């Protein structure tokens, strides 16, 4: 297959801005490159084929160009409906192949997360498992690091993260990190800490609790 | 019998490569050195014969084929080449005996904004055979859906315009090409008789 | 009105087989080649296969060739994708698309294929209690952990739909057990922790589960 690589993988911008997305083919694909738009959970929409031909009905603020191995999608004067993920696809030879996508998100001022830590409930502990939850609320931009410490020992491999899409009103993200332990491992230790590093914070913010305290 | 090469090299019009022109010339005499030694040619390549031995070729007919391509495609006018020109427009046989002559024609064949007159074939269902010509204009089906006479996605008009602009780089400027092929009794010409 | 209606997905056990269908209406089906594309959960688009308008030529992504078969029954106006020996890499939303001179101009609605050994299971709901250090004038966070359910989705509301501001319900995560888990959180004034009550309403249709969990300061 012909490998397609888009860059960047994500970018932020505002209504009225011009944006440029790049798609590179590892082999020459002449001018036969298509562009698609997809919004979360929705069917993809074909925008461009043969590098620069708009499908009927597609606004001309979407402009495709390039040939051979280097291609660009330029969106002039962004409108609110344009924030979405964009995919290229070479249609020069079989099998057709997609790039990995570029997410176009709404730019806004930096905001630090408000951080919260939640011990496992007594009810869950009765069941044999302990979930410790760390919440990072209303931050921007998306990049954030969450490190779990249990009696100052760094945790690896026992937590999962989940992030919301940009908030419909303030365009921030929120993130949950969940540390999962057996009841015995949880009751073996005292200090549970979530350390958060984010561009909006001067220094990392740590929230902690001691097992059994209030 | 002097070879009528004035009609070939100095013709008033040149064909598009997809519709390349052939003039068939009976056995004739010509001073090939005035051609081979002319600074007006940017390419003068021969096959099955050396340029200094053209005068000694024994032949029954010479075919003079001529057309316009862009500069970076002159390399495709040779035996055993591949590419859109050699595969879909003008194909030489493996046992070609004769020469390929080209010169830059930017002063005659470019036009500001583009020349829509000169075209080449972009796609074909199969490669051309040697010295085959294809002037059809059927919409080319590149995908899984019959075009049925409508242009669009994976359904392409099969010819492309060169759009020769005077300020193009030399590799994208027009070149006029003359191909001389020498045949002796329907086989390739050779240098015959006492050496 | 061109329509493409997909069926045949759902939860299927590893190693088994399935056939997705894409029923076409409103156009001459036999005049169009057809494609399958897919999207694994949280991932990008992937091209899967194409079949000629007349069922002749067929092409496949390198990663699916041999185990996937694309086919069509023009007498039934239907496109098919058959998968043998299902595995986790096959889990995805599968879309059919028509190839026309106009482009990829019509799509099926998508059918989700979930390759899993799990059975349907309603969630356990635990409180995420507000911290006792929530001082007056400040903001408190509270929530519900919705753990160990299958398949997706669950829905979460707060106070039967009255509390919407500051609610964040996170995307589900697939645990190594094969069951999903998510949290839903809300921030409220700390001063309200005494007066106002907070209840999360968790609904899981596949198990006919409804749980109202009251979240209180411990
Ligand atoms: C096609 O038509 C050509 C003429 O067309 C006009 O000119 C061209 C440049 C365009 O502008 C076109 O639009 C015009 O309509 C015709 O050109 C002729 O080509 C031959 C071969 O190159 C030339 O012969 C050389 O002549 C010079 C001397 O030229 C001067 O004197 C003559 C009169 O005697 C004048 O007519 C000229 O204008 C010049 O003032 C010789 O010195 C030279 O020999 C030397 O150089 C060669 C290497 O090139 C060596 O091998 C020799 O040993 C010598 O060292 C050539 O003999 C001829 O000048 C030229 N005529 C014109 C008017 O330009 C071309 O032949 C036609 N093609 C065919 C296939 O018929
Ligand atoms: C993303 O935005 C930042 C911040 O700019 C603010 O938010 C925007 C959404 C818009 O409303 C601006 O008017 C706001 O000021 C941009 O950073 C600024 O960039 C300009 C131009 O380079 C620079 O002069 C400022 O100093 C920057 N401000 C800060 C705080 O760094 C950033 O450029 C935007 N990103 C993109 C890709 O457009
Ligand atoms: Cl490649
Ligand atoms: Cl792909
Ligand atoms: Cl259950
Ligand atoms: Mg990919
Ligand atoms: Mg013979």
Protein described:
The complex is a heterotrimer of chains A (about 210), B (about 200) and C (about 220). Chain A is mostly beta strands and about 210 residues long. Chain A has helices spanning about 120-125, 185-190, and strands at about 5, 10-15, 20-25, 35-40, 45-50, 55, 60-65, 70-75, 85-90, 95-100, 100-105, 115-120, 130-140, 145-150, 155, 160-165, 175-180, 190-195, 205-210. Chain A folds into two domains: about 5-105, Immunoglobulin-like (Sandwich), CATH 2.60.40.10; about 115-210, Immunoglobulins (Immunoglobulin-like), CATH 2.60.40. Chain A is built from two helices and 19 strands. Helix content of chain B is about 10%, strand content about 30%. Chain B has two domains: about 1-115 and about 165-195, no CATH class; about 115-165, no CATH class. Chain B has helices at about 5-10, 30-35, 85-90, 105-110; strands at about 20-25, 45, 55-60, 60-70, 100-105, 120, 140, 155, 160, 175-185, 185-190, 190. Chain C is mostly beta strands and about 220 residues long. Chain C has two domains: about 5-115, Immunoglobulin-like (Sandwich), CATH 2.60.40; about 125-215, Immunoglobulins (Immunoglobulin-like), CATH 2.60.40.10. At the A-C interface, strand 4, strand 9, strand 10, strand 12 and strand 13 of A face strand 5, strand 10, strand 12, strand 13 and strand 17 of C. The structure holds a molecule of 6 linked components (NAG-NAG-BMA-MAN-MAN-FUC), a molecule of 3 linked components (NAG-NAG-FUC), chloride ion (3 copies) and magnesium ion (2 copies). Chain B: This is Spike protein S1.
